[PDB]
Structures are given as structure tokens and as C-alpha cells.
Amino acid sequence: GLIVDTRDVEERVHVMRKTKLAPTVAHGVFNPEFGPAALSNKDPRLNEGVVLDEVIFSKHKGDTKMSAEDKALFRRCAADYASRLHSVLGTANAPLSIYEAIKGVDGLDAMEPDTAPGLPWALQGKRRGALIDFENGTVGPEVEAALKLMEKREYKFACQTFLKDEIRPMEKIRAGKTRIVDVLPVEHILYTRMMIGRFCAQMHSNNGPQIGSAVGCNPDVDWQRFGTHFAQYRNVWDVDYSAFDANHCSDAMNIMFEEVFRTEFGFHPNAEWILKTLVNTEHAYENKRITVEGGMPSGCSATSIINTILNNIYVLYALRRHYEGVELDTYTMISYGDDIVVASDYDLDFEALKPHFKSLGQTITPADKSDKGFVLGHSITDVTFLKRHFHMDYGTGFYKPVMASKTLEAILSFARRGTIQEKLISVAGLAVHSGPDEYRRLFEPFQGLFEIPSYRSLYLRWVNAVCGDAAAALEH
């Protein structure tokens, strides 16, 4: 994005600090190159001269104004992708009710009852429960009135900047590279879910390479489905981005919202409008009010789906700008936001696409960064996707998501107070795919203090989950 204006104001929006994450028993054993994010300017782990306030908004280095020919090319790729998407999903994209938007539907989770409410409610000292009744699924006078302004297209708001309390690598703690969640007002999240929640639920249900989205997937069961698909192709690539959601140019966002969320595909007219309010935004941090043109706000519920849709359109755009006669069946891909795995039988020169991705404001590099550039001949077993590799389970003959042991060591080393037992059971599901010996080693520090699931139990759970016929047929 491009920072066009920077004001100073009386009303101080506090970005309440301190980490809730504390070290575990495993921290002393593994000693990971990782730690809690720098949430304070007075944090001693930061380098000398590094102001935490400026490092956050340094990602906004411009809003790339696309050429008239490029914008025409981008709209074709947006409509072509939207054609594929709405053909698979259907056109049942009518607005959710206020009840269904709060409480959710099949394929879409319920709204969180005690997360931050955004502005101006955080300054007034209100929680989400004061505004919205999450049990009954109804709204108070304040939210009700705000939804009327959105129907008339007169709603104004400012995003509350929120420092993401998470585990990061030491280099990024020292450099002050703390990621942020642009917390929009709860009524905006309510109305966005009203306008496109039906579409989002349908995308979650139909996740796969045909629509090119892994959002709403379950890696345990879906790695076999994705694994066998990408294994068929001669070439596979996994691409990285530098500040993907920030570098979405306003032209690319507007064109996408125009072509994907049309009234002809069953949407309300305000579906395009409410999404278009994310293009030019005002961000509140301490006493500052930074106005940013372009870029997606980080963490606004539909961020994953919007980034995934844009990632699909960029690949079609980039290949058509370089090669001739490129269609959707020329290649295949799967995406989760910035995360991406592309594949094709044609020897596609991904190194040549760098200038073509640069016309969107995006900088592409290979995830396998040991090589100097992109190369042909890589299979699915080489790539990373959702921090997981595609390894063959030799017992069943299925693909399984295997995370790196350094990542599992880092995850286990820290936890929020009084959530370790819950976290170990969750992390055990991720760790089982590394094998029995590596599973025993990762949970050795927690033996005696907490309940560690057996390798045997979580293996048998997984074999049924991925294929019920496989587990059933094994019993004869």
C-alpha cells in the first residue's frame, strides 16, 4: 500500500502490550531459534535504533498503478477465474440473515463472542457482548443502526492496529518485525459475513485444485487428495511473496471485487461495496491515524479467501502476460492466502515471470531459496505448503503432512498460561506424521507432567480419517 496521510489526534488508541506466551519444559531441551514477538518499544531483545512503530508500517512502500492494457488483462483473468469458481460453487450467494451471520452455517464458523470489538467501541470500554447477543444471535441499537448506514453506503470506520502475540524467529524479534492484525469494527465483520458468508462457506466445502483454494481444508485427510493430484505433473513450484497482503494494489483489488462478487452471480449489490471499503483504509495506532491506499487489511475474517482468490488471478495474469494461449487448464494450483503450489506439464519459466508479477506490485521468489532462481523438474515431494511437506506413508500408501522438526520444537517450546494440556493434544496431531521415533523425542520433556497421546492411537485415528475403507478393509 501507499501511505497518503499521517495525522495526530487526541484520542489515544492503546495497543496494550505484554506477551501471554511463556516458555514450557521443552524450551530448555530444544533451545529453539525462536521467541515471543516484540510487543513493546522498550523490549530489550530489540536492536539499537529499531523503533517498533515504524517497522510495522515500513511494508507499505507503494500502490502499483497498473497499465490500461494490464488492467484489461487482469479483468479477463479475474472473470475467467470467477467463471471457474462460480461454476463449481454455484450461484447461491444470497445474503445471510443477522442470526446466520453471527451463529454461522455449515462451512462457516460462528463469530467469536469475546475478541476485540474494534473502534470506536474499544475507546468507550465496551466488549462485543454489550453490542451483540451471541447466544440469541441478535444485535443491539448501536450495531443495528450501523448496518442501516452500510445499506445506504454511508458507513465510515478506522481499523484498530493490533500487535500479533505469537512465536517468531529471533532475527524478526531483534529486527522488530512484529506482524499485525487490522481489527475492523465488529459490525463491519458482521455485514461482510452477511454479504459474502454464503460464498465463503461454499468455498470451504469445495476446497481443492479445481477452484485453487485450500481454505477450509483438513491437512490430515486432504493431503492424499492434493498429493496424488500434483504428483501427476512434470513440473511443480512453490512460490514465496514479500508482504503479499500489503502489496495488493488498489487496481487489482477493485477489479477482483468487481468481477468475482457480481449481482449476476447471486450476490447483493453491497457485496462489492463492503469489500471495496478495504482498499482505502484509516489505521489507528497509539496517537497516529495512518491513511493507506491499497493493500488488504491483515486479519479481517475473509482475508484468507480474498488473498487466495487474488493469488489464483495473479498466476493466470502472469502466464498470459508472458506466454500466449494460456488458459486455466494450461496449469494447476492450490493456494492458502500467500501460500501457493503451482504445477504444469509445460516447462514454464517462473524466473521470467518476476517482471510480470512486479506489474502487480508483487515480488516472487522460490520457497526452496537454496537455488539462485526457479528451476524445472521439481516434484510435489520437494515443496512446502501450510508449513507441511508431502511424504508417503509406507504403511497405508497415502500422502501425509509432515512439518519440520524445528517448527514442532518451536511450537512446543512456548504456550499461553494454562493451555499446555490442550496444546499438546493439538500438536500431537501435527507431530504424528514425523514417525514413531521423532514423535517420542518431541514429547519426551512433557512425559510425566501431561497426558501425551500414543503414536499408535493417533495413527489409527488418521488412517480412518483419510479413508474409512482403508481402515475397515484392514480388519480381515
Automatic annotation (TrEMBL):
<feature type="domain" description="RdRp catalytic">
    <location>
        <begin position="234"/>
        <end position="352"/>
    </location>
</feature>
<comment type="function">
    <text>Mediates self-processing of the polyprotein by a translational effect termed 'ribosome skipping'. Mechanistically, 2A-mediated cleavage occurs between the C-terminal glycine and the proline of the downstream protein 2B. In the case of foot-and-mouth disease virus, the 2A oligopeptide is post-translationally 'trimmed' from the C-terminus of the upstream protein 1D by 3C proteinase.</text>
</comment>
<comment type="subunit">
    <text>Interacts with 3B-1; this interaction allows 3B-1 to binds 2 polymerases and act as a primer. It also allows the recruitment of the RNA-dependent RNA polymerase to host membranes. Interacts with 3B-2; this interaction allows 3B-2 to act as a primer. Interacts with 3B-3; this interaction allows 3B-3 to act as a primer.</text>
</comment>
<comment type="subunit">
    <text>Interacts (via R-G-D motif) with host ITGAV/ITGB6. Interacts with host MAVS; this interaction inhibits binding of host TRAF3 to MAVS, thereby suppressing interferon-mediated responses.</text>
</comment>
<comment type="similarity">
    <text>Belongs to the picornaviruses polyprotein family.</text>
</comment>
<comment type="function">
    <text>Plays an essential role in the virus replication cycle by acting as a viroporin. Creates a pore in the host endoplasmic reticulum and as a consequence releases Ca2+ in the cytoplasm of infected cell. In turn, high levels of cytoplasmic calcium may trigger membrane trafficking and transport of viral ER-associated proteins to viroplasms, sites of viral genome replication.</text>
</comment>
<protein>
    <recommendedName>
        <fullName>Genome polyprotein</fullName>
    </recommendedName>
</protein>
